[PDB]
Amino acid sequence: MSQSNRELVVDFLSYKLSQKGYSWSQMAAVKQALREAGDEFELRYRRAFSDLTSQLHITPGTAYQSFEQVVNELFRDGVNWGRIVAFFSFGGALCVESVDKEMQVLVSRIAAWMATYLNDHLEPWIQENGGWDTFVELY
């Protein structure tokens, strides 16, 4: 109960601080910049985004396969912040598609796949380029 209440307070305070241009913490700054970068990505390329995501066809047996094939090609020749934002947007779209197809159970798995890929195949590059602090500056 106490941890939950604490989390709720911090969440709300983080939000209100960001509406005026401030932040609760570095992590909250990263989360908000990533949220906005994803909005920007999906809006600036709305037609492309709808076109691409409308092609997705998930099953429990092929969800992982589809995730891995998209992400590996997205970062085929390396990493940059643009690709990282696209990676989050793709993950978001795949979760939405999952709920759309009454497969919400996939959402927690996709979150795991993303965190796993982030840890083992994106984190090294991010730390090479100054850590997440760099992106907040860059966005």
């Binding site: 390329y45 691409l52 094939q69 998209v70 590996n72 090609e73 643009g82 690709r83 696209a86």
Partner: peptide, 20 residues
Amino acid sequence: WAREIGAXARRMADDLNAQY
């Protein structure tokens, strides 16, 4: 396709990246 979504994500991501 999954690969060929991935490549044509990477058009969009490089063409987001280039303000970064």
